[PDB]
Amino acid sequence: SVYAWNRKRISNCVADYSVLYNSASFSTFKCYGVSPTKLNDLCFTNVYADSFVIRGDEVRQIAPGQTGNIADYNYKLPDDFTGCVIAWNSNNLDSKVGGNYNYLYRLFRKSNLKPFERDISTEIYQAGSTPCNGVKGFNCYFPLQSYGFQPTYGVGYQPYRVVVLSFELLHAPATVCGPKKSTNLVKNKCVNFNFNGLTGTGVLTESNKKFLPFQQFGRDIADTTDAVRDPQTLEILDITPCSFGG
């Protein structure tokens, strides 16, 4: 639900944002702190996923500096938020011909919801001065109401699935990041290489020395790299500077 929006922690993996961006089945995908093109380039510690199904009209309400029945009581999003949200039509999945009543939204709240805060309380809302013992009466109401998603509901009213991606930058080591570029191995030509940050120019040949199962690269003396193990076939290469002279 939206007042009880689920929270999932994603860390210690690689994120495939390209397949998420290229997909054309997503109704809404807009954000400003990070442009989607460069999202795979730079990465953070971990991410938070919040999945809930909302009405089509309310989709625009989930944005920084917004207020509404959802943006103020069911979910509050801080103005300094980074990342963005994926919304897509789910009328044929979430809704049913008899009317989906399995989703609920908070309508009343004495205190406005705080950013990145979820309130699961179901206290009997009180408006007037009448003493109510948790029972409905003159002006004592309920903070939660239900969705009535139906297949015959028009656009802006059909059940749309919405996943909020919250990005955070703790001082702890970053875990989730983007993929590689791979390219292709070429030998016996003065080229330049970037083997896991081992940036440098040279010519790569085949060698015969044996690394123990845990080294990554060797060196000989005066701290100059002399051999590298490729991270794909686990073979020992060699490095020679392409010639120069007067």
Binding site: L107, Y141, Q145, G148, Q150, V155, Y157
Partner: protein, 596 residues
């Protein structure tokens, strides 16, 4: 304890279930109308009782709120309807007696049976039959008998029921802080908001009749013309100085006079506006007709028609086993759902009717952002007027030529345009005086200023002067002409039908005023005119949020109700009929009668 803030919470709580339950009821009604079956009959009541019982407790809660200090105009307007409990102002016995008398008054009308004297077992009903006997025929005996049977076997048996119903309805209306019952009907044409735009029920009463005297030269001449032509049609039946009976009107009540257009055609050799061969030649089925009309709607500037309408709506004939009504209806089930229910046929009249239904759809979706209690027209006379504006704009030969329907070398001129305008006027200005006198009669019957003896003898002796239709036969007070009507047994307001067309013409003038179109008003077209949309757009989205007094400001500068376009639209027909009625004296002498 504040009341203003908690009123909004109560409104939201009421709405959250109000839209849902109204949507369920609308879906059930559409299901029943689309396909009828025994199962789909009892569920209608099973939903209607719940919907009605939902309206009682919300108004029950709408008495503890002191609606005298709430400052928000929107909140005050919204809770004004909330305090309206409805029929809970009298005793339960009186309420059930009134419900029973309404039901029996409707059923007696629904069981009308009149048989021919020669064959005692051959009766005819409101279905095609005795109504058609005097609708399209050239006779004076069968028409006389049919009208006599209708006015004697219907209305006379309903007389005591109406007698009790009038006083009961007046009494229950008095308990709602109302001086009468007609005041409740006039409450729609009433605003108590901003100063300078305020309106009163008595203001409506006076302004609905000060808008009637400006059409006297337009009407009387026409009457004389009709009378004059009736002289060439029915010699030695009516004196040239008198007035015609109700049998020759063409309808059981003479509301529509277009049935005599073909009989009284000036130039019968000139063909009328016919495109039937054009409709059938290239197979104009219902879908492509609706799509071309939608293209015209887009050319007006209206928002794009919503996807899914082509799917849910059943455009064609319902079929053979799935019985359904053929009443042209445009359903707005809510929550973004729109549908249409019509028995489509390839006619120009059905073309205009489809235009009307889609105009209703557009107007309905115009105020979708309103709260649950504000998705209604600012008055009764905008929905029908908005729908009929499109019908009026779709009949111009300019648009018909623009859609490849008429020959490019056509010879439209003054004679055929005058004939078409006469056909239009027999429907347009052919209803004003009878409607006005009917509504006035209902009003002082509601008021009670006329006693129990001046009810039926007054009806004809005032119809003689308001319209000019002679009493074909002697009658006593046991007769009741008005009771033999659709909008008298179901308690339906009829004043809407008076201003409605006027609104059209006002808009039909005002838009034309903002159209840069030179020539006659009838030939004025709004096709390919984006500027003609936004003026309308400034009011359609208003809905019931703003009173109609201020709503009638973005289209017409004048906020009053002055009858400008009736003397503006029908200028050539009137100036040609002045030439036509040079010798025939206009007006009717209320002394000649068939019996004396």
């Amino acid at each position: 304890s504040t009341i203003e803030e908690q009123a909004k919470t109560f409104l939201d709580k009421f709405n959250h279930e109000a839209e849902d339950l109204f949507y369920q009821s609308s879906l059930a009604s559409w299901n029943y109308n689309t396909n009828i079956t025994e199962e789909n009959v009892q569920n209608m009541n099973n939903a209607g009782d719940k919907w009605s019982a939902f309206l009682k407790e919300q108004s029950t809660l709408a008495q503890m709120y002191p609606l005298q200090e709430i400052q928000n105009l929107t909140v005050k307007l919204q809770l004004q309807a909330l305090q309206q409990n409805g029929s809970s102002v009298l005793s339960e016995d009186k309420s059930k007696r009134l419900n029973t008398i309404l039901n029996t008054m409707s059923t007696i009308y629904s069981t009308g049976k009149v048989c021919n004297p020669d064959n005692p077992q051959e009766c005819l009903l409101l279905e095609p039959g005795l109504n058609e006997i005097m609708a399209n025929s050239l006779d004076y005996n069968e028409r006389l008998w049919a009208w006599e049977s209708w006015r004697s076997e219907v209305g006379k048996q309903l007389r005591p029921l109406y007698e009790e119903y009038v006083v009961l309805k007046n009494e229950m209306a008095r308990a709602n802080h109302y001086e009468d019952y007609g005041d409740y009907w006039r409450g729609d044409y009433e605003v108590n908001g901003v100063d300078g735009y305020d309106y009163s029920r008595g203001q409506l009463i006076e302004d609905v009749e000060h808008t009637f005297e400006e059409i006297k030269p337009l009407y009387e001449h026409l009457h004389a013309y009709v009378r004059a032509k009736l002289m060439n049609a029915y010699p030695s039946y009516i004196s040239p100085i008198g007035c015609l009976p109700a049998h020759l009107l063409g309808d059981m009540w003479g509301r529509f006079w277009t049935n005599l257009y073909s009989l009284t055609v000036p130039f019968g050799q000139k063909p009328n506006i016919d495109v039937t061969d054009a409709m059938v030649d290239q197979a104009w089925d219902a879908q492509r007709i609706f799509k071309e009309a939608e293209k015209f709607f887009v050319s007006v500037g209206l928002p794009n028609m919503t996807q899914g309408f082509w799917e849910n709506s059943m455009l064609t004939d319902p079929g053979n086993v799935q019985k359904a009504v053929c009443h042209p209806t445009a359903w707005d089930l809510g929550k973004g759902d729109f549908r249409i229910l019509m028995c489509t046929k390839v006619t120009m009249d059905d073309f205009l009717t489809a235009h009307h239904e889609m105009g209703h759809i557009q107007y309905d979706m115009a105020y979708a952002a309103q709260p649950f209690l504000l998705r209604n027209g600012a008055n009764e006379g905008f929905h029908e007027a908005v729908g009929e504006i499109m019908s009026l704009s779709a009949a111009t030969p300019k648009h018909l030529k623009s859609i490849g329907l008429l020959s490019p070398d056509f010879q439209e001129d003054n004679e055929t345009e005058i004939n078409f305008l006469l056909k239009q006027a027999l429907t347009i200005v052919g209803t004003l005086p009878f409607t006005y006198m009917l509504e006035k009669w209902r009003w002082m019957v509601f008021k009670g200023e006329i006693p129990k003896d001046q009810w039926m003898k007054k009806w004809w002796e005032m119809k003689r002067e308001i319209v000019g239709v002679v009493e074909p036969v002697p009658h006593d007070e046991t007769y009741c002409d008005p009771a033999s009507l659709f909008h008298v047994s179901n308690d339906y307001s009829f004043i809407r039908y008076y201003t409605r067309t006027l609104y059209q013409f006002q808009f039909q003038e005002a838009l034309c005023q903002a159209a840069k179109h030179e020539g006659p008003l009838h030939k004025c077209d709004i096709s390919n005119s984006t500027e003609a949309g936004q003026k309308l757009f400034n009011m359609l989205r208003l809905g019931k949020s703003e009173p109609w007094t201020l709503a009638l400001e973005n289209v017409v500068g004048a906020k009053n109700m002055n009858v400008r376009p009736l003397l503006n639209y029908f200028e050539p027909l009137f100036t040609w009929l002045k030439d036509q009625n040079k010798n025939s004296f206009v007006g009717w002498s209320t002394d000649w009668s068939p019996y004396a």
